[PDB]
Every structure is written in structure tokens, then in C-alpha cells.
Ligand binder design. Structure first.
Ligand SMILES: Cc1ncc(C[n+]2c([C@@H](O)CCC(=O)O)sc(CCOP(=O)(O)OP(=O)(O)O)c2C)c(N)n1
Ligand SMILES: Cc1ncc(C[n+]2c([C@@H](O)CCC(=O)O)sc(CCOP(=O)(O)OP(=O)(O)O)c2C)c(N)n1
Ligand SMILES: [Mn+2]
Ligand SMILES: [Mn+2]
Lengths: 556, 556
């Protein structure tokens, strides 16, 4: 009889099913049409609930939670442009593998395409970007609960990576006291309600087989390239490459300790590129390589075979080398393809890389963004994690710093958007509970400015460094035309972030020299709150510093 | 030979063709992949250029420009999540008819699905929401310039309303010096470059035919409902209805002058609906009706025929009445179906409407949001325009105020998103150059908070009133369950907007009483700048006032 009651019973099945697949964090934005989903989630004690008013931010908060915890994270939004706002986070999840479960409330079919308020066409809205799309029917008892839980069990069970869009139509009335309507319909699931398993267990694993000729290839002159991977995997890749005697080119996202640091610099040296030409095989573990010189070297290297090992699917080599694309957990893959101790074949590169670090160290004194990135190791929170933003900061750190082996780094380097970095960082912190250092540019912070509301709640100290060089100065680094650069590229906004911090009652510092930067950190790490540290620097110094070091190191 | 130069010639054709279809405003966000488009736009003198760092805000800025100018507005963004951020404005445009031309730069096909940075699958990404989608091929001279301009001319030429997605892949290099490459390719268009018309003129008109039985129907007992329409059309509808002797139920968006004001209250009176049961025909002009009582009356009324006249396509009656759905310019439609002077047939409703307004007037004194809405007609800037936000404020003004006929009102009541109101308002101002009054809630303001960046540049005074009732109090109006209401619906953020105004150097007022509010207004209209006025009010006072007034009038 009661439509509102059945809606919530219908919804309760969906949310309880999710808990059988390890969903613990759920991010909720406010709405009315989402009432059945939101009320079922609120009443279910298995969940940790997060809220936000900005659905674009909500998406990235969830992206952050899934990024660190490696479990699927659910999102609830109401119908309309609220759903559309989940698109950036969904597209990023599609690239880097985070499991986002988007539960999008909808008008029922009779309120579609008839000029009803807050009614849009939602099925298929995200095109091909979700891993799996479910368009749920108009709730009705004539469809049994076992069908509904199975549909969800299928989507979550077979989810190797990426997002699941579950569109959820609900007809009014949405509110009203609880009736018995739908109760017996639910009870057709029996003691599944007391169980901890899915109704339907469908969980095939996707993995490449062992390469039987590995023991043949590990004898050749090889190069190891390490991109984004877990902290423990980075440590393991360093030992593995060192044992093999192959040079290790380590991205800032690899957490390998970068035993050959400043690769973006020494790879620019002809002696380095000449020596790497003797490489017969390249084994790349991880992907989304950061540095330009590395991308250029990868694009041009012509080994007999090119392998990329990663747990995400699809092609990952933008140069399309002859070789192999191996789907596996990186740590698992290393145990299956073990190193055996062999004499190092590189002699020139270890010298060049050390000279390269030396040239950077010689310029460490100036109070600029290049120097911050170079020295950032000195500022990492103990037993914490680094969240690196996009544009210059991730590049300067890749090229100029040597990050410690196994110290956790997180990022949004799938599509490399600057639209969710503060809110993503909030999720990265909440997932692990660790003290967090997050570094972003001035435009990035403006972009996700209202996410400072989320940073009012962290479980441990989070230092947010906003590097303010007045615009997107990455476009001072690229060869953009001078006449239009300022108006159409840099887009300086001429702001500071003191009032932003005060509005959300966050501590704020604007250090003028290294001593004052060091004082600000000492203060910030004392409490489980977010501290904003704004570093004001001359617009083009970072880019020019990077360019000069490249030129200097290439002539060594 | 030169790839960078041809990229620019190819784009030059794209942007020049748009100028032939009335495109004058172009909104640009920063990026590298967009270089051919952005440099092509910057060098074309036909355009007025606006910039912004937030692509979501950018989209809404364009939406506002198009909303007021009723001309197509172009948008240029770089590849990636930048593209996704345009979705909210595009969906809205698809519902209310704004013509947005989205030029979304893309990676070339050989860099799709292979792990390249910032490259995602962009074709078809907006699903069915653009009116038309163009997926441009990889730029090449082997495809004639006349094909490219013809492609754009077909799309803009046949564009009745809504958005066009033009995906524009470009291969690197993007930079370099301008070459001769592509010159003759362009010159194949001959003196089209000096012309002012499209290469291909395809502009069929879509319009309903004259209703041959209008002389029969206009003599019946009719009801006129006015939804959203232009300011001039509103005055014309008022005269039209008044001549017919038909009661006019005028929405806050109609600008008809609302001769039977407070319809949201008196429609709740059983005597009014009893009289309306005599109506044999309903003629509605415009759509997106605001009030709950009007939507409920529409749903339950049963005239022999229900007509909806509007210039946008598709069904607009969420109640699906037997009747007609007529596509036409409303003013054109009125001249084709003129009124005949006839005796008004309604007797009970004019009394009720007057008593209803009396009841609202009796409560005008309290310093609350409900009184603000009621009194807003007293604060409209002379020769200016009102941008009204979503949630409560548009409902309170609809229920409690009587706006003057022909006074321009703008809104986002397509999808009713709270995600782009500040940036839309900025666009609404820049298009007309008129003094603007914009009113939004605290969460709406937080949502589009970085759009304050845009509000630093207006051509005339813009007053932004932020009603701060600490959360989304529309969920205090709706029968949401109290236990979860605060955390999961209202979501109070406990902030103020003084520091936000300070961050962007906007003057700020927080009035304590009507005198201080009128003082704030007097100050603001004096300079071509944005003034922020934050009205702090008791959380639930507005919702309850509305609920009490509804109760009172229903008992009259
Ligand atoms: C949502 C969206 N829309 C537009 C862009 C384009 N985009 C970039 C990509 O080119 C960066 C590729 C990368 O990092 O790998 S960087 C950039 C400016 C950032 O300025 P900043 O924060 O002040 O930092 P700074 O440059 O160090 O001074 C933009 C606007 C984007 N990425 N995402
Ligand atoms: C992008 C998006 N996401 C979520 C929503 C849902 N939604 C609403 C729709 O229900 C309003 C339909 C309508 O206006 O008719 S209103 C609302 C809260 C607004 O709070 P406020 O600005 O502080 O003002 P106040 O509530 O009057 O106190 C939300 C969160 C949305 N519309 N769009
Ligand atoms: Mn910057
Ligand atoms: Mn509010």
C-alpha cells in the first residue's frame, strides 16, 4: 500500500548489499529525491558517513577515501545536476582504478521528459566512463528482492576497478511513517539479512599468467622504470632492481627512494641517453609517469621488448612499443619474476645522477618553489603521507627532490585535474588517519576553495601548503606565446589565502624565509587540525630554476 | 608541413564560422591542449573574451551570458576533467534552451586509451544532453575547409535551442612559429572570409500552426497560467488575459505583474479550486512552474483541454493532460491568437487573492527571509534586473511578493541546481550591462564561492544578498524526519561571508535591521561593483512563516 515505505525497503536492500563487498565509507550530499537511499544509509550501522554540500567535492572526497583504503566507497546524491557534478571524480577513478559506487537518485520514468523540476535523463549520463552501469527499474514488489541484490552483487563482485553508476528512480511520496509495506518482500531473502556474504558470489579475478621466459630476459641489459604504486611495492621494486643490477628510474609517485635521483635532469644528458641505448628490455612497474624527460626517453627508447606491469587494465604505453602489458598486483608479480644477483651494467649514469643532485643542492638557499620542492623531504610528517597536487609542484618535486623509500605519496595523476585537490586530500587523510602534508598551487586551491569546509575535520594534523605564484605558472614553463600568456594562460587572480582560512577557522601562516617556514610547521603538527601555509613566491622563478638546472645538467 | 600552424588554421575556421551565427561572447579556461582554439579566439576581433579558472563556473558564466543575450555563447576548455565540469551548465541549457557552443579540445586518437596524461574518452561524453554533437576528426589538409565550416554551419543553423558539443582533437606540436601551412587550404573558401553569412545557410524554423478553432475556445471559461517568459512577453500576457476575462495565475518568473498574487497561498483554499473546476480550458504560456500549490492544482485540474505555449520543445505538462502542446514564440503566438474583450467569469478568487496578500502584509515587519522576499519589490534597482536563486528564496518571492510587470527576472529553474548561481548571475550582469540584484542561500553561495572572483568585474552595480539560515532550510519546509534532518539534510556549515568578501575585495554589509539594510542598498547602487550583503536570520523562521500563512489563507 505505502509507496514511501516500499521505497525505503527497496533502498535498504541496495545499501545492505553494498556492505557485503567491503563498502564502509559513504559520502552523502543533501537532497529530497535521494531520501530513501540516504535514510537507509543513515540507519545502517556498518557505514562511516561523510557529508558535503558540493557534489563535485563529494566525488573527490570519496575518491580520496578509496584511493588510500583500497576499498569501494559509496556516494549518494539527489537527482539533477548534482549527479553531473560526480563526473570529474568518476573519470579519474576510471583511470587510476579507485572503486566509486555512485548511487544517484532519480525521478521515476513518468516524470522524465515532461518539464518536471529537477528531472533530467540520467541513465547513460556518464557514457563509457563507469566500469559498470546499472539502471534500476521503477521500484515495485513485483520484482523480487533476490533480483535486486543479485544485480548489485554482480556489479560489485566483478568490479576489477573504476566506478559503478547505479541509477535509482524513486516515486513520491518520499516521506511518511514506516508501514509494513515491503516487509515480507524483504524476508524472501531469509537469513541473508544476518549473513556477512553476498547473496550471489561472483568474483572472478583478472590476472596475467607468469612469463615463462623471464629467467631468460633477466640476464639481458635491462632498465627498471617505476611509476605510481603502493609504498611497500616501491620498497620491493628498489631491492629487486638493485639485485638485478639494472638502473632504477623512479618517479616521485613510486616511493622507491629514487636511488638515481633527478632523473628529469640527468636524462637530459646525452651520455645518459647513450648508455640507456644498450638496454635490450625495459620493465616498467606502475604508470602515469610524471617527468617530461622520462616521457621523452620512453617515447624514443627502442629496446627489443617493453613490458608494463600494473594492476589496472588496458594499454599504458603512450609510445606503443613492441612488448607486453601485464595485469597483476605488482608485489605478487615480483615474487613470480624474482631477481637473481648480477653485476650492474651501468657505470656512467650513477655518476651523472649524483652530479645532478649536486647542482640542485648548490641552489637550495633561495626562498622559492623550486627550493621548497627540493627540500620537501625535510618537512614530511613522521609516520605520515604526502599528497602532491598537479601542475608545477609535482614536476618540481619529481625533478629536484629525493623522496624516501616507502614513504606514502598520493595524487590525482590519472587525468591530472586541478578541480578536486583539496577535497581529495581531505579523503586521503580521513582514510588513513595519518598526519598529512598536501601541496597545491594557487589556482588549484581557488578551484576547490569551498573544500576548506571539509578540512575543518581531520583526524590528525594536515598541513596545506598553497604555493602562490599568481597564476598557473606551468604556462611560463611551456613555450606559450608571450602576448596572450597572461590573459589567456596564467590567469593570475591576485589573491591571498588568509581570509579563506579565517572563514573556515583554519590556522594560517605566510612564512617569509626558511626559519619562519620551519616555525610554521613546528606549530602546525601539534594538533589534529588543518593548517594553511601560504608560500608567496615570484611568478616565474620556479619554472626558470627548473629550466636552468636542465641546461646545466645536460652540459655535464 | 608544420603541425602547429595547421592546427591553428583549422581552429581559425572553426571560430570564424561561429561569428556567422551571432556568437559574440566566448568563455575561455586555461590549458595547453586548447592552444589552437584559444589562440584562434584571441586573435579574432569579433569576440568579447571572458576568462575563469573553474570550468564549472565558466560554463555557468556562459549560461548567464546566453540567458540574457538570447544569442549563442561559445566556451573553450582544454582536455580532461575540464570538459566534464561543463556538464551542469549543458544540462541546464538543454532544459531552458540557452545555446552554448562547447569547444572541447581533445588529445588525438592515437593518444586515447593508452595511459597518456590528461587524455580521456571525450566523444559522446555528454550523452543525450547536447542538442547536437560534433566529433571532429584528426586535423588534416586532406579534408577540405568547406567540409569543416559546413559541419559547424549545419549544427548552429538548425539549432533551435540548447547546447552543441564540438569535440576538437589536436596533435602536438601545439606551439611554434606561424607558418604558411594551411594557408591555401583556408583560401579555398574564397571571399567567404570577407563575408558575413555562413558558408551553408540551413535555418529551418520550428513552429506550431495557428489553431483554427481558437475563436471557439476563447469564448469558453478559461484560465491563464504564466510560467517563465521574457519581460516583454509577460506584460503582453497580462493584457491578453485581462481582455479575455480569464483569471491569471502568474509565476514569479512570468513578470506579468501577478494580478492574483500569492497564488501559492490562495490555491490552498478549497473555495478557489472549487471555482477553478468550472474552467473548461487552461492556456499556459511558459513553463517551469514554481509553487507547490500551483503544481498540485495543475496535477488535479481537469479542463476539457490543457494547452502549453512555449518556444522550447517536448512535453512540458508533468501531469500529462489531454490537450495541446504548442511550440511558438509567445508574443508571436498571442498575435496569432488574439484575445476578444469578454466579461471576467471569476468571482471568488479575486477576493481570496486580496485577503491572502493582506495576510502576508500583516506579517511584513519581522527581520526575516520571508519578509525580505515579500518586500523585495520595494528594493529592485531602477532599470535593473533580478537574479533569483533556488531553494526557498524563489518560493518565498513566488508565494509572498508581487513583482512589477515587465521587470526582468532571471533564474536557473531548468534543473534547479544550486551549483552555479553566482557565476550565472555574473553572466546575467555582463550581458545586459544593467544594475543587478541577485539573491541566494548560504549553501548556494558556498557552492559557487570561487565565483566571487568573477564578481570583481561587473559593468554596473550588482548586489548579492546571501540569506544565511545556516543550512538548506528547504528541508525544514519539507516533512523530512527530525532525527536525521540536521546531519543529512540541513547540513549547516556554520560560516559567515565577511572574509570571503574580503578575499576578493568586495564591499560587505551585515545589516541588523531594515534601516541598516536600506543603508546598505543606498551605498551599493552608487558604484559599478559587487556588494555583498549577508542577511543572518533564524534558521527555521522562513519555512514556518510560509507554513503558517498557508494554513491561515486555507481557512479563509
Ligand atoms: C580541471 C582542470 N582544468 C584545466 C586544467 C589545465 N591546467 C593544467 C594542466 O595542463 C596540468 C597537467 C598536469 O599537471 O599534468 S595546469 C593549470 C593551472 C594550475 O595553476 P596552479 O594551481 O596555480 O599551479 P602552477 O601551474 O604550479 O602555478 C591548468 C588550468 C586542468 N589540469 N584541470
Ligand atoms: C547541484 C544541486 N545539488 C543538490 C540540490 C538539492 N537541493 C535543493 C533542491 O531540492 C531545490 C529544488 C528547487 O530549487 O526547486 S535545495 C538545497 C539546499 C540549498 O540551501 P541554501 O542555498 O542555503 O538555501 P535554503 O535551502 O533555502 O536554506 C539542495 C542541496 C540541487 N538542487 N542542486
Ligand atoms: Mn600557480
Ligand atoms: Mn540556507
Amino acid at each position: 500500500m505505502s509507496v514511501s515505505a516500499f521505497n525505503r525497503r527497496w533502498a535498504a536492500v541496495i545499501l545492505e548489499a553494498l556492505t557485503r563487498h567491503g563498502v564502509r565509507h559513504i559520502c552523502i550530499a543533501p537532497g529530497s529525491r535521494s531520501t530513501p537511499l540516504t535514510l537507509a544509509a543513515a540507519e545502517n550501522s556498518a557505514f562511516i558517513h561523510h557529508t558535503h554540500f558540493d557534489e563535485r567535492g563529494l566525488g573527490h572526497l570519496a575518491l580520496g577515501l578509496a584511493k588510500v583504503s583500497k576499498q569501494p566507497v559509496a556516494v549518494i546524491v539527489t537527482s539533477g545536476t548534482a549527479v553531473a557534478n560526480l563526473y570529474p571524480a568518476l573519470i579519474e577513478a576510471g583511470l587510476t582504478g579507485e572503486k566509486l559506487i555512485l548511487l544517484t537518485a532519480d525521478r521515476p520514468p513518468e516524470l522524465i521528459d515532461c518539464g518536471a523540476n529537477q528531472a533530467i535523463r540520467q541513465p547513460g549520463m556518464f557514457a563509457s566512463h563507469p566500469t559498470h552501469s546499472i539502471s534500476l527499474p521503477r521500484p515495485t514488489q513485483d520484482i523480487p528482492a533476490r533480483w535486486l541484490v543479485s544485480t548489485i552483487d554482480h556489479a560489485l563482485g566483478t568490479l576489477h576497478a573504476g566506478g559503478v553508476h547505479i541509477n535509482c528512480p524513486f516515486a513520491e511520496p518520499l516521506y511518511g511513517e514506516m508501514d509494513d509495506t515491503g516487509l515480507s518482500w524483504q524476508q524472501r531473502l531469509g537469513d541473508w539479512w544476518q549473513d556477512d556474504k553476498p547473496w550471489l558470489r561472483e568474483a572472478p579475478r583478472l590476472e596475467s599468467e607468469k612469463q615463462r621466459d623471464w629467467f631468460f630476459w633477466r640476464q639481458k641489459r635491462g632498465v627498471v622504470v617505476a611509476g605510481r604504486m603502493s609504498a611497500e611495492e616501491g620498497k620491493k621494486v628498489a631491492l629487486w632492481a638493485q639485485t638485478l643490477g639494472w638502473p632504477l628510474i623512479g618517479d616521485v609517485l613510486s616511493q622507491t627512494g629514487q636511488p638515481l635521483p633527478c632523473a628529469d635532469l640527468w636524462l637530459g644528458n646525452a651520455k645518459a641517453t647513450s648508455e640507456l641505448q644498450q638496454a635490450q628490455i625495459v620493465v616498467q612497474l606502475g604508470s602515469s609517469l610524471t617527468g617530461k624527460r622520462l616521457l621523452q626517453w620512453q617515447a624514443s627508447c627502442e629496446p627489443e621488448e617493453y613490458w608494463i606491469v600494473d594492476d589496472i587494465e588496458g594499454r599504458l604505453d603512450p609510445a606503443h612499443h613492441r612488448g607486453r602489458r601485464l595485469i597483476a598486483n605488482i608485489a605478487d608479480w615480483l615474487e613470480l619474476h624474482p631477481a637473481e644477483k648480477r653485476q650492474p651494467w651501468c657505470v656512467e649514469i650513477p655518476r651523472l645522477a649524483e652530479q645532478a643532485m649536486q647542482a640542485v643542492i648548490a641552489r637550495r638557499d633561495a626562498f622559492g618553489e623550486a627550493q621548497l620542492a627540493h627540500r620537501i623531504c625535510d618537512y614530511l610528517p613522521e609516520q605520515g603521507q604526502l599528497f602532491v597536487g598537479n601542475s608545477l609542484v609535482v614536476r618540481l618535486i619529481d625533478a629536484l627532490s629525493q623522496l624516501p623509500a616507502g614513504y606514502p605519496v598520493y595524487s590525482n595523476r590519472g587525468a591530472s585535474g586541478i578541480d578536486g585537490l583539496l577535497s581529495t586530500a581531505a579523503g586521503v587523510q580521513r582514510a588513513s588517519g595519518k598526519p598529512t602534508l598536501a601541496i597545491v598551487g594557487d589556482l588549484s586551491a581557488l578551484y576547490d576553495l569551498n573544500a576548506l569546509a571539509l578540512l575543518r575535520q581531520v583526524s590528525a594534523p594536515l598541513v596545506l601548503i598553497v604555493v602562490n605564484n599568481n597564476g598557473g605558472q606551468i604556462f611560463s614553463l611551456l613555450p606559450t606565446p608571450q602576448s596572450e600568456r597572461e590573459r589567456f594562460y596564467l590567469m593570475p587572480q591576485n589573491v591571498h589565502f588568509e581570509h579563506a582560512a579565517a572563514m573556515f577557522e583554519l590556522k594560517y601562516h605566510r612564512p617569509q624565509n626558511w626559519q619562519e617556514l620551519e616555525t610554521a610547521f613546528a606549530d602546525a603538527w601539534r594538533t589534529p587540525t588543518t593548517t594553511v601555509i601560504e608560500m608567496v613566491v615570484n611568478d616565474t622563478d620556479g619554472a626558470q630554476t627548473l629550466q636552468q638546472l636542465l641546461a646545466q645538467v645536460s652540459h655535464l
